[PDB]
């Protein structure tokens, strides 16, 4: 390996290279200027970004001596053996020659010294502290460390003279992902149909080793494809194809979000009949910030992110969420209404923090708050409470959606059939700014939804859905679904009884118009008039708030 | 035990076979294509699916060196010795041959390293993290892991290089269940009248570790029958009877009617005895419910040919004492889908957010062992209209009903779970749960008519001696407004 | 004592109870008076700490089981007897329940508590037994 | 160094500390500088061991046993002053503490001048919380 193998990081690689080379390649300049540079460096960031890879690259390209210390290798059973081990390591590093000390997984040896309760670990960390600085502490040997939880280190060990510089090997951007892809495809033979730039543009949250995993999967698919047919004829002319890469991309997800992978659901914009204007509005809301960044910063304004669906139940809010989940390049995080609450104290806010941190880590990401009124309701209304845990939760949501954040691409979709129960602090612009009313379908919308549900069903040639759409007046999407289901059920009954009659000693290849006619007798309006009046009043009150325009 | 004894998961079996065998059988392919294969697998799924069995098969079949690591086997008293044990295991694996490392029950030595507070677990986790992926990480050794809950694992371990891919060994299906039954009934002495396809059909939520239980129970019944017929034979069993044991269909049917899926062992309902002939009247409702619950399960092929998903929900409302709970008992008795019964205010708890946890747990138990019929008696308690109460008990009722809302129809995987509701005050149920897709059809159960009353009287008097000359038509005429309870 | 034996260490309070029972059975037929069992018997359903359930199970195993007790009796004490395991109020563990809650008893206690001191000649104990009508003893 | 007072042989740490302190006292009116007292001051509650008891008690006994003619004083440097064993803080062993606080703007300028007096040069008002 070498510096050419590491990719996706330029500034961090430059900092490490200078701090490791200039001290041991141009030392006369350091005494000429007078002041020595920082002597310790701490690599931190999410897992699988290139920390140990960077350490290996430094050990390879640099001709100086190298000594590696894994996390818990230092400490053993015998009393004082851990400190003896550190002393031996440092002495052998300093005695022979200029050397680089790399301690892997430092967080396993340096607790905070205030929350720990053991004895040996405290003595070990104090040994490390006194060994790094003091009289005859360190002479012409540089120290390297890698960690995944930088906050889990005692601050006393993270001052100048011990670890002066902290380098953040963070998530790569599109260019970094492209560089990593080019690096990992340098050895395998690849077909001409590939388009690496678009592929990198599609891996919207991948980091480091995840790209390598994608490459490995795309390779494995070909071996399992060009093996059913069976010699040197197959050993050559492999030619990893673009379809293999697309397939491997379709399955794998970023390692950060592996905990919260949503179960596969299959729908499409053709499946969501009606709501064409709302569909296009959502497309231009969700895709423009991600697909056209440069022109976005050309105007110098941030994107608009939040959105709330509100309307009568069984109209398609969750269906729209499913469509966005399955047919958008951005990552998806499905969150239920009360799924985040917990019995313990403060764990609900911890779970909310973890969810939003996972979301913004692998940006762009979409978070779908299902039945938002469950966990984001009016503040102070509850007289008898559990210590105001719900109030704290809604306050946590308020701070997390808009506050002391980095303004990364994280879109929140809220779905609730009860909008008056949401606190006004969430409905403000900046958290959930545009409130989309999802009304009951009209006649053309009824025809569209009926066709969308029946896009897969075989029907008679003379059958027309216009009469069904015209007959229903106050119906919603779920009611038309029920009509279709009843018709299919009656068709199944006819099929099975005909099959039994034939077996007594495809009779129904289609669903007849008679089945729809006699399945519509039990049809009903799910949404009563009271809720329709209430939602219309809510919309009219929203419009009435605006005035003089 | 070989590879021909693990049936039900062919895809996962081949998927593991790929990296465990092919890079050792034919190493030319990977050097030809230029990339190394994955060397990390995490087997997860509900208990009793074949994870340890598959590990045994891999160990027995492959010629590579095998090293077994039990989960809590590593711990020692001295500080820094568990990691010493890990070092000895991995160094032996690397020093000897191209080996396979199987870590059984890895969730007990791999927590998140952030919620735990003990020092030894953090240090051992860091040791494992460095051993799998660090400097000069691994030389042609593949690591296998098994767990019952994957979410309680360190995220740093669920990465390429450490655990490349996670295989999901889940609940089998009809073909898988038939394969398991064939495998487990290949060494025993069956009768000539036994058929397995019907037996594999009638078994619904069995995870594959319950099929072996079914076979063992059938064998135990056979021996019990042949030891009841023959004398106990204290000294020595006669050899002639051993020549003919067999196992009839009745033994399997009896064992099937006793056993239940291991996932539903906590929620087993007491065996009540109601039959379709015990419920008089309501013939149209009885047939409608029978078809609505039977058509999606036995004949999925037609439903998929019509490209529409079956109807799930159903609600019963009417005056008290008309047969709603009786219909629920009748469904629970002689229908083939699994049954989960809950009373009205049974899933409520003192703690905050625990009621929703219970709802999640019961609906997960229902979805795992599908098809399943969930009976919610007295819906008015758990699904009362939300927002009506000016006062509140902390808003818990709103949260529980919302959980029900988005657990019966939300961002979840569609599966065969039917919800039967029973109430005597439908007006105080939120409309959001009465729409199609959650509770499709709302059935009314009126007070019985003359013919219905006569049929009800006959249904109650199946096993009652009466006078030959007693006529019940006058009784039916005399009431004119009664219910079944009267 | 109740609070004394309970600890935060894992597998220590159970060891303490086992050592206590071994000591009691070792020397001679003895009487074990375990005070305030309600603090270490939370009914196993309303509790959340695992140490409480573990010590409850240890107590149950010590009182009843294979060669549980050999000529040694145990006495308990509590203010609220309801907050105890039903398994502990069984026969073989706490088969007998005694209610230790009047004027004559109060007078007897007054007489026995003033036996070792010559108070006076004109002190009448009837007024004391009638005026101190709410004294436990 | 605090964490360097233990040893491999059984109880050989006590001999090491004893010979160290007696050599420091017997030679001359020297000055002894003790690092990381927090490493040897866990409040007596979070120890649960025996080596700490012996070594700390030995240090207490030896610190108490200091004749006036020794003319030797110890200087301690603790970064966690509230996590100190009060037994060590009693009068006659360690009575006077010094609150080494945050420097002022003038102090920041002074340290800046001190550090920059060994480099080729071609701030104390924006630098506020910086210390040392």
């Amino acid at each position: 390996v070498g510096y050419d193998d590491i990719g996706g990081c330029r500034k961090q690689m430059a900092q490490i290279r200078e701090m490791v080379e200039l001290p041991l390649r141009h030392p006369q300049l350091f005494k000429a200027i007078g002041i020595k540079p920082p002597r310790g460096v701490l690599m931190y960031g999410p897992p699988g970004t290139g920390k140990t890879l960077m350490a290996r690259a430094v050990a390879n390209e640099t001709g100086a001596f190298f000594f590696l210390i894994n996390g818990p290798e230092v400490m053993s059973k015998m009393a004082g053996e851990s400190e003896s081990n550190l002393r031996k390591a440092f002495e052998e590093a300093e005695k022979n020659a200029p050397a680089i000390i790399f301690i892997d997984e430092i967080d396993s040896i340096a607790p905070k010294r205030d929350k720990t309760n053991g004895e040996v670990e405290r003595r070990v960390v104090s040994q490390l502290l006194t060994l790094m600085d003091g009289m005859k502490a360190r002479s012409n040997v540089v120290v390297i460390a890698a960690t995944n939880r930088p906050n889990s280190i005692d601050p006393a060990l993270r001052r100048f003279g011990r670890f002066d510089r902290e380098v953040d090997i963070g998530i790569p951007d599109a260019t970094g992902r492209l560089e990593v892809l080019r690096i990992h495809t340098k050895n395998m033979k690849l077909a001409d149909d590939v388009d690496l730039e678009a592929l990198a543009a599609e891996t919207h949250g991948y980091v480091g080793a995840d790209i390598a995993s994608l490459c490995s999967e795309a390779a494995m698919q070909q071996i399992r494809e060009k093996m059913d047919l069976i010699d040197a004829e197959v050993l050559d002319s492999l030619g990893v194809t673009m379809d293999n890469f697309r397939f491997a991309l379709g399955n794998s997800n970023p390692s950060a979000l592996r905990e919260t992978v949503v179960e596969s659901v299959n729908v499409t914009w053709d499946d969501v009949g009606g709501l064409d204007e709302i569909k296009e509005e959502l497309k231009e809301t969700v895709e423009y910030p991600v697909l056209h960044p440069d022109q976005y910063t050309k105007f110098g304004l941030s994107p608009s992110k939040g959105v709330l669906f509100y309307g009568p139940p069984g109209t398609g809010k969750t269906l729209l969420a499913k469509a966005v989940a399955t047919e958008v390049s951005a990552n998806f995080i499905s969150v239920k209404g009360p799924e985040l609450l917990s019995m313990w104290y403060g764990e609900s806010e911890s779970n909310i923090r973890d969810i939003f941190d996972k979301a913004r880590a692998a940006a762009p990401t979409v978070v779908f708050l299902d039945e938002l009124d469950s966990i984001a309701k009016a503040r102070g209304g509850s007289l008898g409470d559990a210590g105001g845990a719900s109030d704290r939760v809604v306050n946590q949501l308020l701070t997390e959606m808009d506050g002391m954040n980095a303004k990364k691409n994280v879109f929140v979709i809220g779905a609730t059939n009860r909008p008056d129960q949401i606190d006004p602090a969430i409905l403000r612009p900046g958290r959930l700014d545009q409130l989309i009313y999802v009304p009951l379908p009209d006649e053309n919308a009824r025809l569209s939804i009926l066709n969308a549900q029946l896009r897969k069903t075989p029907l008679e040639p003379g059958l027309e859905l216009t009469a069904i759409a015209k007959a229903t007046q106050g119906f919603s999407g779920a009611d038309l679904l029920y009509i279709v289901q009843r018709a299919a059920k009656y068709a199944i009954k006819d099929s099975i009884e005909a099959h039994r009659q034939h077996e007594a000693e495809d009779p129904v290849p289609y669903i007849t118009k008679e089945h729809f006619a006699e399945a519509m007798k039990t049809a009903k309006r799910s949404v009563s008039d009271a809720e329709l009046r209430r939602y219309e009043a809510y919309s009219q009150q929203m419009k009435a708030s605006r005035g003089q325009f | 035990v070989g590879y021909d004894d693990i049936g039900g998961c062919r895809k996962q079996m081949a998927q593991i076979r790929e990296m465990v065998e092919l890079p050792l059988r034919h190493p030319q392919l990977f050097k030809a294509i230029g990339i190394k294969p994955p060397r990390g697998v995490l087997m997860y799924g509900p208990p009793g699916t074949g994870k340890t069995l598959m590990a045994r098969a891999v160990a027995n079949e492959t010629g590579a060196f095998f090293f077994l690591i039990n989960g809590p086997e590593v711990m020692s008293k001295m500080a820094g010795e568990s990691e010493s044990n890990l070092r000895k295991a991995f160094e032996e694996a690397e020093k000897n041959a191209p080996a396979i490392i199987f870590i059984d029950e890895i969730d007990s030595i791999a927590p998140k390293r952030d919620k735990t507070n003990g020092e030894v677990e953090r240090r051992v986790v860091s040791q494992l993290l460095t051993l799998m992926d660090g400097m000069k990480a691994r030389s042609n050794v593949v690591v296998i892991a098994a767990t019952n809950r994957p979410n309680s694992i360190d995220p740093a371990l669920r990465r390429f290089g450490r655990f490349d891919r996670e295989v999901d060994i889940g609940i089998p299906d009809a073909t898988g269940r038939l394969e398991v039954l064939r495998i487990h009934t290949k060494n025993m002495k069956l009768a000539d009248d036994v058929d397995l396809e019907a037996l594999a059909a009638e078994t619904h939520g069995y995870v594959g570790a319950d099929i072996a239980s079914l076979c063992s129970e059938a064998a135990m019944q056979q021996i019990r029958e042949k030891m009841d017929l023959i004398d106990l034979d204290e000294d020595e069993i006669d050899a002639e009877v051993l020549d003919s044991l067999g196992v009839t269909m009745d033994n399997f049917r009896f064992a099937l009617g006793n056993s239940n899926p291991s996932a539903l062992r906590e929620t087993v309902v007491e065996s009540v005895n109601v039959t379709w002939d015990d419920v008089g009247g309501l013939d149209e409702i009885k047939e409608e419910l029978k078809e609505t619950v039977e058509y999606p399960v036995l004949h999925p092929d037609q439903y998929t040919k019509f490209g529409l998903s079956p109807s799930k929900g159903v609600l019963f409302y009417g005056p008290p004492g008309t047969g709603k709970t009786l219909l629920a008992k009748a469904v629970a008795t002689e229908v083939s889908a699994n049954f989960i019964s809950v009373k009205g205010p049974e899933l409520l708890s003192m703690w905050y957010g625990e009621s929703e946890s219970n709802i999640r747990d019961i609906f997960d138990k229902a979805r795992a062992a599908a098809p399943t019929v969930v009976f919610l008696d007295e819906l008015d308690s758990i699904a009362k209209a939300r927002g009506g109460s000016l006062g509140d008990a902390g808003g818990a009722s709103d949260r529980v009903v919302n959980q029900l809302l988005t657990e019966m129809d939300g961002m979840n995987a569609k599966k065969n779970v039917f919800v039967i509701g029973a109430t005597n005050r439908p007006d105080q149920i939120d409309p959001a749960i009465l729409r199609p897709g959650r509770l499709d059809q709302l059935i009314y159960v009126p007070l019985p008519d003359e013919n219905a009353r006569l049929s009800i009287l006959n249904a109650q008097l199946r096993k009652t001696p009466l006078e030959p000359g007693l006529e019940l038509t006058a009784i039916a005429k005399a009431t004119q407004g009664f219910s079944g309870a009267d | 004592n109740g609070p004394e034996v309970m600890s935060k260490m894992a597998g220590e309070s159970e060891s303490n109870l086992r050592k206590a029972f071994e000591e009691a059975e070792k020397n001679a037929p003895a009487i074990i008076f375990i005070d305030e069992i309600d603090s270490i018997a939370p009914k196993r359903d309303k509790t959340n700490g695992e140490v409480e359930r573990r010590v409850v199970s240890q107590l149950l195993t010590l009182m009843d089981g294979m060669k549980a007790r050999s000529n040694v009796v145990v006495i308990a004490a509590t203010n609220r007897p309801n907050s105890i395991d039903p398994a502990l109020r069984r026969f073989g563990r706490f088969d007998r329940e005694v209610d230790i809650g009047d004027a004559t008893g109060r007078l007897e206690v007054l007489r026995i508590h003033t036996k070792n001191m010559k108070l006076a000649d004109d002190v009448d104990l009837e007024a004391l037994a009638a005026e101190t009508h709410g004294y436990v003893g | 160094n605090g964490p360097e007072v233990m040893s491999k042989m059984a109880g050989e740490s006590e001999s090491n500390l004893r010979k160290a302190f007696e050599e420091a006292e017997k030679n001359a009116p020297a000055i002894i500088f003790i690092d990381e007292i927090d490493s040897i001051a866990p409040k007596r509650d979070k120890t649960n061991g025996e080596v700490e008891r012996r070594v700390v008690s030995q240090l207490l006994t030896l610190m108490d046993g200091m004749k006036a003619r020794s003319n030797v004083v110890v200087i301690a440097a603790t970064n966690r002053p509230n996590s100190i064993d009060p037994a060590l803080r009693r009068f006659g062993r360690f009575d006077r503490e010094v609150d080494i606080g945050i420097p002022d703007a003038t102090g920041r300028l002074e340290v800046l001048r001190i550090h920059t007096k060994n480099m080729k040069l071609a701030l104390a008002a924006e630098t506020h919380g910086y210390v040392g």
């Binding site: 059973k77 015998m78 009393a79 053991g118 004895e119 040996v120 019995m343 313990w344 104290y345 007289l383 008898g384 409470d385 559990a386 210590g387 845990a389 | 008293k77 001295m78 500080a79 507070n117 003990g118 020092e119 030894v120 677990e121 003192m350 703690w351 905050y352 006062g391 509140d392 008990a393 902390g394 818990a396 | 935060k8 260490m9 894992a10 597998g11 220590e12 959340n48 695992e50 140490v51 | 491999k8 042989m9 059984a10 109880g11 649960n48 061991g49 080596v51």
Partner: peptide
């Protein structure tokens, strides 16, 4: 020679309960 030993017993958590108000 002497030897060390590790020990990690337990900790203490806090729960939250819900109450019902009768106005």
């Amino acid at each position: 020679a002497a030897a060390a030993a590790a020990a990690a017993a337990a900790a203490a958590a806090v729960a939250v309960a819900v109450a019902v108000a009768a106005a």
